[PDB]
Amino acid sequence: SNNLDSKVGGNYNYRYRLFRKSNLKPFERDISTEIYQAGSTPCNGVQG
Amino acid sequence: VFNATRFASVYAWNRKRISNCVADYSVLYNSASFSTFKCYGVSPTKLN
Numbered sequence: 605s606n607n608l609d610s611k612v613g614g615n616y617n618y619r620y621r622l623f624r625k626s627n628l629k630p631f632e633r634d635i636s637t638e639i640y641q642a643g644s645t646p647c648n649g650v651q652g
Numbered sequence: 653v654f655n656a657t658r659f660a661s662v663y664a665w666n667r668k669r670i671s672n673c674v675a676d677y678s679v680l681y682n683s684a685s686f687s688t689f690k691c692y693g694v695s696p697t698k699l700n
Contacts, residue, residue, distance in 0.1 A: 644696055
């Protein structure tokens with residue numbers, strides 16, 4: 605659809621989950637935005 | 653290593669090759685013996 609969906613510098617109507625603490629099961633929709641914790645530093649629900 | 657008495661100079665900075673042993677980085681992380689500790693690409697828990 606590049607001739608259509610592509611808008612200027614970006615299209616924000618389509619978003620994705622970049623990081624997750626575990627693997628999501630098939631046929632399941634998880635909208636949780638909870639901050640992903642890669643290391644041992646506590647995230648406290650915020651970036652860091 | 654970081655608690656050793658003397659170090660090499662910066663321009664002379666020394667690289668010690670260490671291999672074939674076991675090490676626990678979770679205790680060194682919780683030992684509170686360091687001023688600053690940061691990892692890139694691998695968390696301190698994943699090291700063990």
